[PDB]
Amino acid sequence: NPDVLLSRVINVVRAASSLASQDVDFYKNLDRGFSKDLKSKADKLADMANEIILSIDWNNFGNIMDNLLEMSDHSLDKLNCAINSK
């Protein structure tokens, strides 16, 4: 369902926007374990981004966004023949 889970995405989008808003390097100075927790919270991101890598399975990333948007385009052209011919 779009309106539910994207509202939860928006929820985490703002939280992602809430992340590096503060100065983050200062406690990376004050311990590695801040940074390592920030590394560990990125290990979620190393997993949570990998979920859609898993859906497939930077320069890696530049590839598939074409092939994502590859499949967007052949819709509307078919939709053109589904509708404008209709």
């Binding site: 992340l19 979920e51 509307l76």
Partner: protein, 113 residues
Amino acid sequence: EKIKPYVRSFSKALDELKPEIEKLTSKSLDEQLLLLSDERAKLELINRYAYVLSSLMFANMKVLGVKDMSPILGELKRVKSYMDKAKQYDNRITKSNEKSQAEQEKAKNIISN
């Protein structure tokens, strides 16, 4: 002290969205399309998968703290532009059906007139 609220707060949002991801990628990009027949029902599934991923890759790129964010930002208005199109297409499908049903009601009233 200062980092202590936000880092646990945002991780909880990751913790909030983390089951939502697994239900989103429960069935495959082929499967969740190949179970569906309407291309309109196929449509936003392509987008919404990219729609999150766009934000996802914009999110994790902040964690490296790289000063550039453009070549995902350059992808951002793209995904908007394709989301911009078919909605306006699907607006026109309404006017196809919105006025044709008024054609239905009008001509019946003509014999009634």
